[PDB]
Design a protein around this motif. Sequence first.
Motif, PDB file in Angstrom:
ATOM      1  N   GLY A  69      11.837  53.082  78.545  1.00  0.00           N
ATOM      2  CA  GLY A  69      11.444  52.402  79.408  1.00  0.00           C
ATOM      3  C   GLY A  69      12.347  51.514  80.270  1.00  0.00           C
ATOM      4  O   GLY A  69      13.437  51.296  80.103  1.00  0.00           O
ATOM      5  N   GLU A  73       5.630  50.502  77.637  1.00  0.00           N
ATOM      6  CA  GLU A  73       6.780  51.624  78.382  1.00  0.00           C
ATOM      7  C   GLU A  73       6.154  52.464  79.316  1.00  0.00           C
ATOM      8  O   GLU A  73       7.051  53.122  79.974  1.00  0.00           O
ATOM      9  CB  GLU A  73       7.593  52.307  77.313  1.00  0.00           C
ATOM     10  N   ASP A  74       4.956  52.519  79.409  1.00  0.00           N
ATOM     11  CA  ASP A  74       4.398  53.474  80.505  1.00  0.00           C
ATOM     12  C   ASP A  74       4.757  53.048  81.785  1.00  0.00           C
ATOM     13  O   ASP A  74       4.001  52.292  82.473  1.00  0.00           O
ATOM     14  CB  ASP A  74       2.842  53.400  80.046  1.00  0.00           C
ATOM     15  N   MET A  75       5.715  53.669  82.146  1.00  0.00           N
ATOM     16  CA  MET A  75       6.213  53.527  83.420  1.00  0.00           C
ATOM     17  C   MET A  75       5.488  53.687  84.557  1.00  0.00           C
ATOM     18  O   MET A  75       5.782  53.309  85.612  1.00  0.00           O
ATOM     19  CB  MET A  75       7.876  54.133  83.659  1.00  0.00           C
ATOM     20  N   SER A  76       4.437  54.639  84.354  1.00  0.00           N
ATOM     21  CA  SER A  76       3.432  55.098  85.467  1.00  0.00           C
ATOM     22  C   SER A  76       2.423  53.860  85.853  1.00  0.00           C
ATOM     23  O   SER A  76       1.625  54.043  86.480  1.00  0.00           O
ATOM     24  CB  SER A  76       2.560  56.272  84.905  1.00  0.00           C
ATOM     25  N   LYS A  77       2.765  52.716  85.020  1.00  0.00           N
ATOM     26  CA  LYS A  77       1.925  51.617  85.221  1.00  0.00           C
ATOM     27  C   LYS A  77       2.878  50.118  85.403  1.00  0.00           C
ATOM     28  O   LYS A  77       2.380  49.190  85.488  1.00  0.00           O
ATOM     29  CB  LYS A  77       1.185  51.447  83.942  1.00  0.00           C
ATOM     30  N   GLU A  78       4.158  50.512  86.019  1.00  0.00           N
ATOM     31  CA  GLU A  78       5.056  49.438  86.427  1.00  0.00           C
ATOM     32  C   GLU A  78       5.320  49.379  87.749  1.00  0.00           C
ATOM     33  O   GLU A  78       5.383  50.547  88.402  1.00  0.00           O
ATOM     34  CB  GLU A  78       6.272  49.642  85.495  1.00  0.00           C
ATOM     35  N   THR A 130       2.810  60.331  86.967  1.00  0.00           N
ATOM     36  CA  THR A 130       2.318  60.603  85.567  1.00  0.00           C
ATOM     37  C   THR A 130       3.480  59.876  84.681  1.00  0.00           C
ATOM     38  O   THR A 130       4.920  60.075  85.046  1.00  0.00           O
ATOM     39  CB  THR A 130       2.213  61.978  85.222  1.00  0.00           C
ATOM     40  N   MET A 131       3.177  59.446  83.627  1.00  0.00           N
ATOM     41  CA  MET A 131       4.178  59.026  82.541  1.00  0.00           C
ATOM     42  C   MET A 131       5.194  60.196  82.218  1.00  0.00           C
ATOM     43  O   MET A 131       6.409  59.986  82.248  1.00  0.00           O
ATOM     44  CB  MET A 131       3.477  58.344  81.350  1.00  0.00           C
ATOM     45  N   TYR A 139       4.300  54.086  92.311  1.00  0.00           N
ATOM     46  CA  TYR A 139       4.785  54.086  91.114  1.00  0.00           C
ATOM     47  C   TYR A 139       4.750  55.442  90.549  1.00  0.00           C
ATOM     48  O   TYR A 139       4.143  56.470  91.486  1.00  0.00           O
ATOM     49  CB  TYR A 139       3.879  53.405  90.221  1.00  0.00           C
ATOM     50  N   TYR A 173       7.568  61.117  84.935  1.00  0.00           N
ATOM     51  CA  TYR A 173       8.560  59.940  85.041  1.00  0.00           C
ATOM     52  C   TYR A 173       9.590  60.372  83.827  1.00  0.00           C
ATOM     53  O   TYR A 173      10.699  60.100  84.014  1.00  0.00           O
ATOM     54  CB  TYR A 173       8.128  58.777  84.721  1.00  0.00           C
ATOM     55  N   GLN A 174       9.240  60.747  82.517  1.00  0.00           N
ATOM     56  CA  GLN A 174       9.858  60.756  81.282  1.00  0.00           C
ATOM     57  C   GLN A 174      10.701  62.004  81.648  1.00  0.00           C
ATOM     58  O   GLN A 174      11.974  61.642  81.152  1.00  0.00           O
ATOM     59  CB  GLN A 174       9.074  61.098  80.202  1.00  0.00           C
TER      60      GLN A 174
END
Lengths: 304, 300, 270, 270
Positions: free
Chosen positions: B33, B206-211, A215-216, A212, A219-220
């Motif tokens: 997200g 929406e925190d995709m780093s957790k999906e 980092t968020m 995954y 990804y953003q």
Amino acid sequence: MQGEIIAGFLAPHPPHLVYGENPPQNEPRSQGGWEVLRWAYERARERLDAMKPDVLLVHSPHWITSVGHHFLGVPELSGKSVDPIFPNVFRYDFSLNVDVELAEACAEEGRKAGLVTKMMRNPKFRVDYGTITTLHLIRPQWDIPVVGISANNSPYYLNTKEGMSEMDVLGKATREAIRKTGRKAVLLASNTLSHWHFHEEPTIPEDMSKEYPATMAGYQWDIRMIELMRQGKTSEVFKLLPQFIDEAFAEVKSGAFTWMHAAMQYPELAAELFGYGTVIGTGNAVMEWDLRKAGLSMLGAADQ
Amino acid sequence: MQGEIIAGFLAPHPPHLVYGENPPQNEPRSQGGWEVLRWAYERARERLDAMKPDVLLVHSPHWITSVGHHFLGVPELSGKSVDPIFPNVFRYDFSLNVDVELAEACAEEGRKAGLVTKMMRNPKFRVDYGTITTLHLIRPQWDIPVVGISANNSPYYLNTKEGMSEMDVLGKATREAIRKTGRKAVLLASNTLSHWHFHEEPTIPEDMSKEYPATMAGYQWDIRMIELMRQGKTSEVFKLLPQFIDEAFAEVKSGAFTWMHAAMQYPELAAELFGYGTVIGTGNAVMEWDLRKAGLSMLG
Amino acid sequence: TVVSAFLVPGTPLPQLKPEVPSWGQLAAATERAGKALAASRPDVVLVYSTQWLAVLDQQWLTRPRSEGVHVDENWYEFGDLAYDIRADTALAEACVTSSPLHGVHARGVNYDGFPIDTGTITACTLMGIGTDAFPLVVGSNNLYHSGEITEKLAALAVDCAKDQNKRVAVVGVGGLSGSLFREEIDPREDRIANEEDDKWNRRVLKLIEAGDVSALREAMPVYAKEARVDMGFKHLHWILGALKGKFSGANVLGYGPSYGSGAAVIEFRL
Amino acid sequence: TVVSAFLVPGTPLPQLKPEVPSWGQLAAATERAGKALAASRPDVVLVYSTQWLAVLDQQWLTRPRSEGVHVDENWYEFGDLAYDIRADTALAEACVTSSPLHGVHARGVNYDGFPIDTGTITACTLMGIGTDAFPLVVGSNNLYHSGEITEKLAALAVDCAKDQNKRVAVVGVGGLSGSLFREEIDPREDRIANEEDDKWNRRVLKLIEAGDVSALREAMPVYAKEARVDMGFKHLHWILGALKGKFSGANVLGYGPSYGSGAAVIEFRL
């Protein structure tokens, strides 16, 4: 005869992708893995398959040079490519062919344009793992002549700006070489996006339940940046490139992304996203800019 | 005449998808997200748009019925769909139109086929959050009439075997219905694949780093399954379904993906994968079975 | 703290079509339970409905006032279920807080238009609860909680009421045997589906009138499986938990069919 | 335990084209350092090279015998570098294990075909090490390690050696100032690129000869930054860690240019 840039691909070189495909050329055997990015690559694969190009030009961030930009210069090159970071997933026996005259034409044009360029004439040269990974991911048949370009140090030794500026000059020299040669070529920018990652080996690496975004934030940026691309807002992604480089540690700093687009003259063309996904937390997007379709492929009359 | 079933596509109902899109009808707002699944539906959207169907038929696991198989039966239905598990992400204002004429042909045809059916004539009825979610994913314009079908209990009350049998018959009755109405329709199988999942969001849904996939094993089941449909080895995926359902707790049990193929006569046609992604660990794939461009869409 | 306890059906049939003899009986009996509930003078009603389903965190209705017109996904043809449910947010919020402290992650649910289940609605309607005089503290049926965990949520909640010095009437909403008919029938001919479910419903029922908590806990699981009892009979575990696994007698005020399934109104004698 | 210490260039130019005077001199100095190495009679050579890159966890070379022909991605025009490098698997593997103990995740790399870097190869060739008599224990340059951690890694290795009762020669492979020319030059006229780099090189080089650890210690980070020293001069940190920040002095056997960058051969008087 006219020279043509059939299309431009953002072709990331994650070794894990070939690992999960279990090709004959790769020694280690996997339980599969990264099928999303792999399926995404099946798409690019067929698109290229239809294109029937004369050559594939690739700019690889794993062939670092300080003295100018280098170009593979021998007809045939082979070897066993072992990924130094990921030896347990990529040990690939390959052999390919180099479009030397085009390769030389590029060096020629680069130098003419003010860049320092060199021809790699050592037949025992071991083509870098990045280049082999991408070529395999986008064309496993190895039936297309290729032109490998080195990623000059400028963006790192000097600064992102001056570096990119050189990649830009490289790109138009590259476009100039294509036409003067009358080649129907494809461009591959072997770069990943957000490059922050996990500093750990997941035991059994193909465990996708452990894959995954690192980092968020990273990804953003990745999503933001590709949205602009598929939106044809090419000029807007490049204005954002510098900030993207810094905040996301994106691999486009190496320069392939800018070289590919400079050769294509930054088309405000909608890009097709075959797919996105992470690998070791790293964001990877497999995309295409179909210039043939948008009618921006022909470069002009060739020489002789 | 010339009733046709253009295409039928597996179209999951993850509310997180609409949430990340921030449509006008969804109340809560996100910072985005699940873009990968969104992009995948984007492809599906275009396909549907170019389909120009008369009606969309959908079977949703979230309209559970014990007594037979129900069908939406009032021309205009609307309301505020609030997901009960994810109310913080899905609160949608909708207004749709039902192709009552066709819904009735399906029901009657189902009756004659040996199944008990019933038309839903209550005008106050609130359509499923899942049916609403799926409809929104492939058609945000809300301009195509629909036929909403309920997921009868059989799979759970009886068992997967006797349950899927009912769905199969339902599918055939559905086909017979389309063919007699001369309707040019598209089928919608609203089912996720692997359904093992996490337990609550990381505060920032929406925190995709957790999906990511809930379990390795679930992921592989999905991969194995979707890869098979891509190879057009349809008969093979249906042999594995019961094991798939058992081992991956696949929502394909939750009614039918079986109804769709049954309606399409289980075509050994290669399915087009638009994308595969994970939502709360749950495996979601958006695929298509283009019968038109296969020479199998006409019923006559 | 706890002053009353009741188990009432979740089926909307009794309220919707009472003209059917057997159904009207249940409706009337559920109404009689309501009267009893009122006489006990509670300040709050601790509700658990078999049909209010949770999948992730435990849920507790925390919205001050909820009102609307609910239509059953299955019995929409028999009429509508209008409601104006009032909740005790202070107590409910304390339960949201105390829950994770007993090992259960939970959250409050306060959203305009949130889908309150059929059982909870018909219970409020027929029983005359969910009013400002009798606010509710509703606890979801998480499909993953065992009976034991269900009792812990109920005890947990009962303690919150003690700390708020409030009189609590508990109500578990759910049916008994669940062999729902699978085809249309004449409502005038409704009856328990099997003689087996009947014998089973009667057996554990008698055990409840005796307060033989010991034997009841023994039959419960066997009973739930063999008579396909509504949601594992967790709505009964709710009552037991809130009463600390102890009570004497009980008065069955009504017992009849609901499209094949069994349903009853139990008045507990603390 | 440590019986010898040296610092050698990682550049392959001295080896590849010694006929170019300053390169040849640098090559002969490296050869001399090799003789001093052997004279110290070590059992293992603890090697750290700036060009052996790692980005995840620390890597230690564990393949018994690695051989092949390596072509530099920058200096390919100047010839090939053949090698037959032997490692001390036992000691290497012991370092792999001791690494996490000291807060550093590590692994062994044993793969036919693995890319031994240019520095490690030219060092083995010119110095006469990496042989069955002078086996190697090579520890990667992890891009995320500070000079401090590098010192921890090397002291940790000297530790394992003492356990296995092995005399250790320590060798740091890397350059000095790093301002490589960015255009082609005539090799015959190679020189230090900037006078600033030359001066900075002479300055710290003097400190080393003097054994002025303290001053050298504080100058390092500024030097590395201002003269663009190869990988933060971490190859010197490796030498220090092995010597526990202590050494009597040094003998700089050679100092010359390598395509503009600075390079030198240092023999440490423990």
